[PDB]
């Protein structure tokens, strides 16, 4: 296993180190705005060695953005397909790639079968191609990467099994800037190329000065370069045809035979289109082919890439025709005269890089290697697209929600076969799909209109519903005495209980267990552990009584706290927040124990007094002005007082000290320790007044953030013996502090209301002497170091926080773990901050046309690691990576994969087992089974079971921490008869393995394997 933390990989480019030392200045290049006046010498092409021209015929369909994916398909992707099969058909040169496999599916299932056989002849012969074939194009910043493979192996799946291809060569043309996750997973997948455009100006026009904007991609941490994947950077503004056939778009647009003007087009350049004919084509031959000469002066070899395409091209008819008559006029002329010496053609993108790869080994080129990332991008002046980090930030938080609920069900209904009647595949298709599609640049993104929001927000509550069918008929199965089982498919055996989604005070959608002794005394509750080791945490279930007590079962008695349940109220009288108990439901609260990728049931029993393993907390409420606070029966009366400074300490935890306003001040790890100075804070940002306004996609701000007027707050203390919690109502926030034992959990009810034009953002501040360095992650995957740049504006220093951030020195470190994607920085020295949300009025003419005024309150989930770390074993200075330790990286899975909860449904569960997964391996902590998935239906005599495994990298930090089971996938199901790795997809076998025996993987390394299974 190669050493990710203490070898500093040698790269030509490294994207930090280029970032140190670039000016990014903004000066007019010329007809290049962001370039400069490209020269090139005549006598560089010949006849002995050509400029070999591959012209891309390509149509961008996003799968919603400003209509919904249903409405493009009906007003203009199925025609665009459909013509594109006909012209295709008739006209044997012309080649087309498509992209978003999301559409294909929709149309190709619609065809009749004499056009689906055309269609496969049309891909079989080279004249279609699908690039990258994912289910969608989707975004790089906010997606997890295991919902980038989710989508990548949905689109892929689909493609085998009815193109019979699977794609080598990826296409990314819009996301908001690109991360170092997909050539990784790609890469992992079969993939030898890869395409990429949305990159910051100033980038590219340094790296297109040094001719480095094709090159090999490797990971920030990879010393031996295994993980790189050869990359096209594209040098220009856009993929329209402006920019694409040259550096400039005046000229470039006469090229686009779609803007003379019966399509309603036109050219901003105010030169249009001429039809090509024989007494203009040498001249406008001569203008084309000094453009391409041009564009080819930024690259190594003689063959160069013209993409020719938009936004939902190739609809009509007349346009296929217009633009493919207008290009083979000037191609035989092009192609004939002998003194450009050129060949051009229509091509594609395989074809590209074929003939680059074949110029390489030719000797003709080499290629330089490159680490790094993409953010933040900006295409003009200080126009940085941070804002999308955060836009919509329900929706942001519903994808992680989702991501883990397709998970559990894949998992928990792998271990069977289903009959076709339980319907387990339909569903568990409609999931991953619906999860898929919001991984579009426009839907986790935040950057769709209003009404395609709610259409996502809809399709993924009906994938959330259909993995809770298939979970629950699950774990019926898998804790039923398998000869009283008596199924029905339509019945729902257990309910789910999740605490977080959507929330307390977002909706209220829980529900209560009704125990009484005239109507039901007891009842049984599951547990599901999706991680391959042993896991203990703290659940919770609202019950009628708080005269509960828990065992397990074997009738064992487990230790449990009663909580009141609280509802903060937005007082329209008082003009207050306050919070309101009820008086006739309760929290109640134990600890589970879960086997690794197990289950585990506990009983709810109700008795007429307060049982003997049942605590109850106490309850402070701090307000000037308090009116009393009944609570029903449950036993401790609320007590009041004056706001006042307060400190807690949860078992041997560490000790957090609050503000009167109920804001955390310190954190005393140890009973002996420092109080480290941790301080949480709420600002504001504006919108300019004069000059380019923040939207959906830029962050403009109007200078630093104002701190949020908090007034005098109301906060209430729950302190009990497994949780306690300091909760405070400020404007636009319910902000929560959350102690069990480690690490707090923070929890911020955000609903920004009517403020318009605002930004609320969630700060630490501490002493911590970080300087001008910060760690944020990419895509769930790893950590990336970030180095703050005063010569850049507020807006380009923030990152996406897909899943956390931290700053260090050399003794201290702070984490921020996340449960939903937002943007954030470190502005100043001992400083972190993220954003919660924002509501913005006016569009920012990134084509949307409409600002973001459809927010709704969310609750978003944090974990706040402060931890000593001048005896870990941390990368050199120079390194750009850095590591989560153990505790912060179960903090991310406390939040991302944390216990699901089933309430059985009935009265009585006849049959009922009390745990299942007891014998599964408890792998080592740094080990994940990302993904467990079936891969056959019942039908199938050899069933084949596919797992996806990641091994993340945790810091050496002195804890001898050992003994566990290696985990060996292959053997989890019985009756093995073969194990194969697998691309990462599980599409393609790379490895028969001896023994049947899946080996672990390595640190920062993600592996697939198939287990056959004879019966
Ligand atoms: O958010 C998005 N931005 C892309 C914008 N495409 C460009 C045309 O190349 C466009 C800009 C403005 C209006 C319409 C279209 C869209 O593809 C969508 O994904
Ligand atoms: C699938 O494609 C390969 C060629 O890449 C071929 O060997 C096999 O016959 C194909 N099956 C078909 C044609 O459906
Ligand atoms: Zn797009």
């Not at 999706?530 to 509960?548: A, C, G, K, N």
């Not at 005393?668 to 709420?682: A, G, N, R």
């Amino acid at each position: 296993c190669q050493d990710v933390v203490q070898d500093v990989p040698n790269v030509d480019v490294q994207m930090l180190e280029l970032y140190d030392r670039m000016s990014f200045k903004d000066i007019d290049g010329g007809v290049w705005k962001q370039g400069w006046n490209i020269k090139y010498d005549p006598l560089k092409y010949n006849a002995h060695h050509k400029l070999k021209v591959f012209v891309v015929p390509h149509s961008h369909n996003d799968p919603g953005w400003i209509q919904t994916f249903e409405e493009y398909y009906q007003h203009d992707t199925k025609h665009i397909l459909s013509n594109a099969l006909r012209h295709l058909h008739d006209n044997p040169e012309m080649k087309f790639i498509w992209a978003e496999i999301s559409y294909f599916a929709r149309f190709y299932h619609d065809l009749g079968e004499n056009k689906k056989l055309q269609m496969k002849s049309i891909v079989k012969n080279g004249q279609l191609e699908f690039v990258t074939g994912g289910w969608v194009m989707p975004d790089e910043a906010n997606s997890h990467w295991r919902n980038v493979l989710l989508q990548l192996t949905e689109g892929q799946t689909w493609l085998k099994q009815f193109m019979n291809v699977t794609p080598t060569a990826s296409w990314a043309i819009d996301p908001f800037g690109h991360s170092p996750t997909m050539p990784y997973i790609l890469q992992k997948s079969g993939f030898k190329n890869m395409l990429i455009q949305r990159t910051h100006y100033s980038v590219k026009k340094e790296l297109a000065q040094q001719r480095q904007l094709e090159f090999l991609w490797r990971q920030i941490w990879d010393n031996k370069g295994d993980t790189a994947l050869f990359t096209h950077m594209m040098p220009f503004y856009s993929y329209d045809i402006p920019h694409t056939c040259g550096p400039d778009p005046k000229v470039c647009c006469q090229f686009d035979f779609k803007r003379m003007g019966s399509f309603g087009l036109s050219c901003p350049w105010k030169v249009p289109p001429r039809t090509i004919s024989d007494q203009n084509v040498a001249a406008r031959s001569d203008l084309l082919v000094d453009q391409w000469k041009k564009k080819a002066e930024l690259y190594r070899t003689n063959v160069l890439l013209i993409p020719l395409g938009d936004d939902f091209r190739f609809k009509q008819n007349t346009e296929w025709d217009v633009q493919r008559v207008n290009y083979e006029r000037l191609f035989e002329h092009i192609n004939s005269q002998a003194h450009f010496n050129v060949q051009a053609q229509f091509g594609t993108l395989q074809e590209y890089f074929d003939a680059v790869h074949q110029a390489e080994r030719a000797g003709q080129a080499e290629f330089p290697t490159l680490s790094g990332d993409f953010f933040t991008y900006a295409d003009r002046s200080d126009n940085y697209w941070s804002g999308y980090y955060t836009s919509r930030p329900y929706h942001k938080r519903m994808d992680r929600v989702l991501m883990h609920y397709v998970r559990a069900a894949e998992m928990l209904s792998a271990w069977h076969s289903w009959d076709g009647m339980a319907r387990i595949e339909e569903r568990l298709e409609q999931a991953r799909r619906e999860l898929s599609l919001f991984q579009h640049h426009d839907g986790i993104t935040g950057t769709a209109k209003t009404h395609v929001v709610v259409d996502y927000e809809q399709r993924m509550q009906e994938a959330l519903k259909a993995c809770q069918m298939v979970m629950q008929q699950s774990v019926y199965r898998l804790l039923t005495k398998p000869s009283i089982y008596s199924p029905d498919f339509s019945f729902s055996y257990f309910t789910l209980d999740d605490s977080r989604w959507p929330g307390s005070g977002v909706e209220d959608s829980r529900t209560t267990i009704i125990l009484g002794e005239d109507i039901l005394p007891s009842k049984h509750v599951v547990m599901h552990n999706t991680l391959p080791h042993w896991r203990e945490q703290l659940v919770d279930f609202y019950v009628s009584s708080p005269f509960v007590s828990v065992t397990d079962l074997a009738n064992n008695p487990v230790e449990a706290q009663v909580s009141p349940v609280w509802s903060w109220h937005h007082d329209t009288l008082t003009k207050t927040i306050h919070p309101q108990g009820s008086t006739t439901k309760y929290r109640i609260i134990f600890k589970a124990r879960v086997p690794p990728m197990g289950l585990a049931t506990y009983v709810l029993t109700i008795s007429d007094s307060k049982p003997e393993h049942t605590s109850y907390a106490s309850n402070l409420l701090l307000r000037k002005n308090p009116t009393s606070l009944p609570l029903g029966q449950y036993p401790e009366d609320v007590k009041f007082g004056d706001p006042r400074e307060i400190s807690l300490r949860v078992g041997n935890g560490p000790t957090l000290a609050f503000s009167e306003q109920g804001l955390l001040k310190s954190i005393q790890l140890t009973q002996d320790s420092p109080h480290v100075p941790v301080h949480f804070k709420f600002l504001k940002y504006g919108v300019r007044s004069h000059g380019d306004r923040s939207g959906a996609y830029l962050f403009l701000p109007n200078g630093p953030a104002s701190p949020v007027e908090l007034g005098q707050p109301v906060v209430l203390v729950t302190k009990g013996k497994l949780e306690s919690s300091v909760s405070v109502g400020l404007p636009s926030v319910v902000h929560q502090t959350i102690m069990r034992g480690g690490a707090p959990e923070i929890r911020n009810l955000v609903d920004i209301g009517s403020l318009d034009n605002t930004e609320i953002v969630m700060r630490l501040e501490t002493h911590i002497d970080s300087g001008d360095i910060f760690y944020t992650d990419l895509n769930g995957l790893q950590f990336i170091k970030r180095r703050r740049l005063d010569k850049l504006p507020l807006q380009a220093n923030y990152y996406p926080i897909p899943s956390g951030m931290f700053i260090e020195d050399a003794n201290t470190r702070l984490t921020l773990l996340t449960g939903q994607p937002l943007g954030g920085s470190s502005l100043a020295s001992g400083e972190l901050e993220i954003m919660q949300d924002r509501r913005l009025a006016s569009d920012d003419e990134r084509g949307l046309g409409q600002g973001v005024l459809d927010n709704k309150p969310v609750l978003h989930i944090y974990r706040l690691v402060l931890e000593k770390v001048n005896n870990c074993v941390r990368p050199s200075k120079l390194h750009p990576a850095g590591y989560l330790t153990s505790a912060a990286h179960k903090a991310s899975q406390s939040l991302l994969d944390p216990l699901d909860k089933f309430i059985f449904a009935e009265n009585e569960w006849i049959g009922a087992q009390g745990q299942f997964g007891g014998d599964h391996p408890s792998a080592r902590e740094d080990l994940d089974v990302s993904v467990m998935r079936r891969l056959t239906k019942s039908s199938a005599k050899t069933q084949r079971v596919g797992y996806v495994l990641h091994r993340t990298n945790l810091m050496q930090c002195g804890t001898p921490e050992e003994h566990t089971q290696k985990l060996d996938v292959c053997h989890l199901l019985p009756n093995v008869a073969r194990c194969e790795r697998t691309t990462l997809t599980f599409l393609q076998n790379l490895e028969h393995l001896d023994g049947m025996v899946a080996p672990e993987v390595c640190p920062m390394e993600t592996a697939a394997y198939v287990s056959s299974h004879s019966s």
